Amino acid sequence: PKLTKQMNAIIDTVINYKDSSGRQLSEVFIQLPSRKELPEYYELIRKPVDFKKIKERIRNHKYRSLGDLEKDVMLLCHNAQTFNLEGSQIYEDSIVLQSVFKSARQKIAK
Numbered sequence: 640p641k642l643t644k645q646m647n648a649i650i651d652t653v654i655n656y657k658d659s660s661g662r663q664l665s666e667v668f669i670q671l672p673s674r675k676e677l678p679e680y681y682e683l684i685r686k687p688v689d690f691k692k693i694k695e696r697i698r699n700h701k702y703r704s705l706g707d708l709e710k711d712v713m714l715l716c717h718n719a720q721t722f723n724l725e726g727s728q729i730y731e732d733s734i735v736l737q738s739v740f741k742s743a744r745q746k747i748a749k
């Protein structure tokens with residue numbers, strides 16, 4: 640109950656985060672392209688995950704700890720770094736979002 644609320648607060652912080660230029664960094668990460676739209680993603684990435692899926696997993700009580708939530712957020716960001724070119728905006732945004740997650744978890748949970 641309190642855990643579910645901690646998780647929703649943390650993920651909401653990550654999703655709503657805007658950089659100093661006003662850009663909501665999460666936007667591209669909410670929903671993966673389909674298999675038909677981007678078959679090469681699914682050829683490369685073994686364990687696809689997006690923020691929509693993480694929200695599903697929170698809603699359905701699938702993460703039993705903040706550690707388990709963190710593992711999926713880090714997976715998402717790792718997949719983004721794997722697929723996208725180093726130095727691309729999406730690659731760089733995924734690094735920022737890792738930090739935003741860790742700060743949100745420090746702030747909300749401690």
Ligand SMILES: O=C(/C=C/N1C[C@H]2C[C@@H]1CN2c1ccccn1)c1ccccc1O
Pocket residue numbers: 667668669670671672676677688689690715716718719720722723729
């Ligand atoms: O890498 C991810 C997405 C990369 N895409 C999304 C945009 C930019 C790049 C190529 N894109 C396409 C390509 C085809 C159709 C729709 N979007 C990604 C998205 C959600 C969660 C994890 C991810 O790695």
Ligand SMILES: [Zn+2]
Pocket residue numbers: 698699700
């Ligand atoms: Zn429920």
